[PDB]
Symmetry: C4
Subunit: 289 residues, 4 copies
Amino acid sequence: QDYSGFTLTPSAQSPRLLELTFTEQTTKQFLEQVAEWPVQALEYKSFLRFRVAKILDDLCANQLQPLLLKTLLNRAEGALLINAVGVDDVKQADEMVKLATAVAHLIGRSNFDAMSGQYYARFVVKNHRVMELHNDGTYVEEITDYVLMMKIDEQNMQGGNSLLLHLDDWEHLDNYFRHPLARRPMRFAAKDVFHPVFDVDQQGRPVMRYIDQFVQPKDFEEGVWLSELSDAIETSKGILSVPVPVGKFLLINNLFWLHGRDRFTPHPDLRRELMRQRGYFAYASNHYQ
Amino acid sequence: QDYSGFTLTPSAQSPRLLELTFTEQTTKQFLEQVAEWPVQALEYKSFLRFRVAKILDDLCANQLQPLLLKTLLNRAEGALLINAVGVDDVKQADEMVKLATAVAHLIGRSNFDAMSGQYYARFVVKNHRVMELHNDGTYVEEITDYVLMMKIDEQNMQGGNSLLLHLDDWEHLDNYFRHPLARRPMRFAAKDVFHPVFDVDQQGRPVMRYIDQFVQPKDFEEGVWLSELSDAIETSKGILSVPVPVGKFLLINNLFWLHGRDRFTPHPDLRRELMRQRGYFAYASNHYQ
Amino acid sequence: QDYSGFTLTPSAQSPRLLELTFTEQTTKQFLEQVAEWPVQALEYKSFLRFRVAKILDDLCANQLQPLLLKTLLNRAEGALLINAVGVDDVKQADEMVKLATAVAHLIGRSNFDAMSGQYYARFVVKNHRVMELHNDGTYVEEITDYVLMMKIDEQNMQGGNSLLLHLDDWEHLDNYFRHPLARRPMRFAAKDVFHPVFDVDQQGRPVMRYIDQFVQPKDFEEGVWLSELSDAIETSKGILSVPVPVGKFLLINNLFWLHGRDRFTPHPDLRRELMRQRGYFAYASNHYQ
Amino acid sequence: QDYSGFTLTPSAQSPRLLELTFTEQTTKQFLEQVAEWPVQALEYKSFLRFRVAKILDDLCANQLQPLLLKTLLNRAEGALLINAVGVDDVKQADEMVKLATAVAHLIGRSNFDAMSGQYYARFVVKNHRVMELHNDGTYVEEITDYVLMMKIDEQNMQGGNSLLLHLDDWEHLDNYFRHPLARRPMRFAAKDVFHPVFDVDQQGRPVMRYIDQFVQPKDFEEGVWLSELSDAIETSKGILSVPVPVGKFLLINNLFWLHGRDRFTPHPDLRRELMRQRGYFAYASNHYQ
Ligand SMILES: [Fe+2]
Ligand SMILES: [Fe+2]
Ligand SMILES: [Fe+2]
Ligand SMILES: [Fe+2]
């Protein structure tokens, strides 16, 4: 269909990854209407995160929030690459944070990031290897429903695409899901938590909560299996390789998408800045009370 | 009426805010009788806080403690601006702390202040924006019954009045109090605590436990409402603007008064020193055992 | 009677305070027999504290341990001033610690001292006011049964005697013990603990757990009473003033003795070093199992 | 018998201590096959510890894991001295860690080492006294089943042999095991834990959880007994004195072996580097579900 304030087109890498682009009129109006709250105001007063969310959704005739929720919750999709025309330079990092915040807080709430002390975190990489596919939030009890990763800056960067794996594109899903250890609660440590690497959604379809660094196999049986699982994920033919240009961000359902990052070329002048948010879904629906 | 040791007159800003002034004979006698305990003695031995309280009340023929309790607990009032003639210069900061301590510990006990490590805290501001109305103690389980804010120093200060809002002067009270989210326990974080923004006193009248920085709306529904609540409070026509000259302190019922601070003019030589205490009420009354 | 290895004579200040002096043959033999364990060995391996205790008691034909327990547990007494001939100079501080350790671990076990990180602590004072009478261990749940305070060094020291008050020499005991607030559990804070300032021993006789710095009266009623209690203790005619020369230590029952320290004369060359241990009683007795 | 990939011969010190030596073909093949995972990879992803374990066991035709478990669990034995030909120089410390990791994770899992922050720890000693026999893990609730101690470097080292005591070579075992205090839970502190110094295996045979530094006797009775126990262990005629050359490691059952270290000669150029791992057993067996 045709949407108010933005366009939605499938990506070249996969029909499951949809590209959402806010128009120029939508973008400059949003930035104008949220100009009176700097990013530090969003940091200090969390309800402003929801206020700028509403402002953005209002500028899209309230078509954005239902579209975001539909896409992220659709098992067939669950992934967005989002950008706003005119917001594509590192000098607009604050506008980038505002826009991502507004998008994230239409579908839920972003959790505290221990590495930044805020509801979002920015990293710069300077001075090489593939970051293996994984889910976020595997070492805490609360489920992380979504991962938001935004490219703030990118200079002298060859490679480094975001890697994505939708569980239903993973050719080995059934082999590992049907193994008894898939249901075995395992220890995860950054207090420790225990949960299986696999679970099911409400329909019985597999979801995952996996990362190689924080899973703690208790014995030879668990360790060998996890090392085979790791291999079966990293060599999967279903992995997507997605460039994320400055100003764009991926927003993915953390339960049936795994994400990672490809190796990049070391270069003295290399600078890549990322912004991340992770949170849970929260939305109105017709259900029992 | 006429009181022993002090005078009580309504303020120019509101009949709910009463000005209590200790006479010169009362003030110099109190300071004499408490001279043997410096402020550091009140810090180290908390029962001395109550001893100087009794000394002050005794010098007022025991009319002070019942008057303080009557005023602070009276829904129609609940707020005092207190001073002592001759105590009006920053060089008398210790006398100021002693006097405020004696007053506070006639009606209750001042709680530990994490920012100072003592039962009171002093701030100096040097080197601009309005501090929004709020209640203290919203992020701990124990109720903060009273807020004490004392002007220790003020130099080259244009503006910066204390802002006050009595809930019964808030023209939007019923609109927000009657909303279902008014009774929804929300998360507050500086361990997290959960409580609604609104509650009731013993008679069913609204009281509040609100601050925009520490309330953590869990979703879009809560966030938008809190952002409207914030606006409805900050633009209320009922807000009082009270100058607090050096040596005076506000003492207010933290349950149905919100407090804040107006914007002030930045000035190189600007110095404003404040002293704060927060605590709970504790007092004798005829009730069942 | 006549004891093996030591003498026992009443002090000049009170028949309740007994002076125990280890003879020269007892002292040099003990130091010889414990020479192979330096103080740091007693710090690292707590069972050595009991080994040197046994060694000392064995050198007294096993008359020391029963005498120590009898004296410390006797309501009429409960206090010892202990020394060993030839151990009276700060250069013998390690011998002092060994001797005090052996004595303490015949009657119980010394608790971890947070200020030193060991089962004992040494302080030096250099660069004035009376330290009010009190019990130790009032802000933890476990009862501190005994206090051991040893004079390691004393130079250019006028005054500074240890102050002692046996509850049965306190002329106001009955007045405060019979007050309802004597049985009121009050908050003590250095996690907080709650216990009354007064309690009873197994026979119903008053014992105390009081210090002015850490008791936290919750309201005007408790604060005024504690401030009167404090005054009634500090002005008691029953207070003993005991010089503690280098090499001597007081060992007192912390339940019915309060201890403190008199004011001393400031002097540029003043140096006083103390060693303290606090612990619980533990001893064999004929009782039911 | 004859094993695939390694040889097994009894030590000169005791038939209970078996020497396991990986052949050159086994060693160079293992190092080749695990070359793609550096030690830091084993630190960050614990399942790789089990992957290199399997790789090593596969190179021994799967005869290694059952042999390791049989030996460590055999009451008559329970101790291995393990090495790999060609791995005997401090410059091969990473190969040493890889090999020890593979061995340890065939029989169980190595626990987090608080002193290193990793599943193993390396110490260097430079700049004298005997380290008394003891068990590891006495101050936590979880049982430490095995201790792994590897000699990484040794220069200008006279003495310093590892000391070992198998409980069934301890001529005083029955005397202390039959004492009532052997079954008395005692306090151990580095939260505190309580457990007896002695326990039994599944057959009722004594096992121990003892160290002199962390056991905290509560009274004279416990302290004197522990000090006699300590003496009876340290003077036992059953103690083995085992040189551990660079590249070799002891792997012992921590329940019925105590370990320690002999005094060594201080020397300006002395350098000895050790690597330790401690963990629990975990292995497949036929038992009820
Ligand atoms: Fe991630
Ligand atoms: Fe405030
Ligand atoms: Fe004391
Ligand atoms: Fe050890």
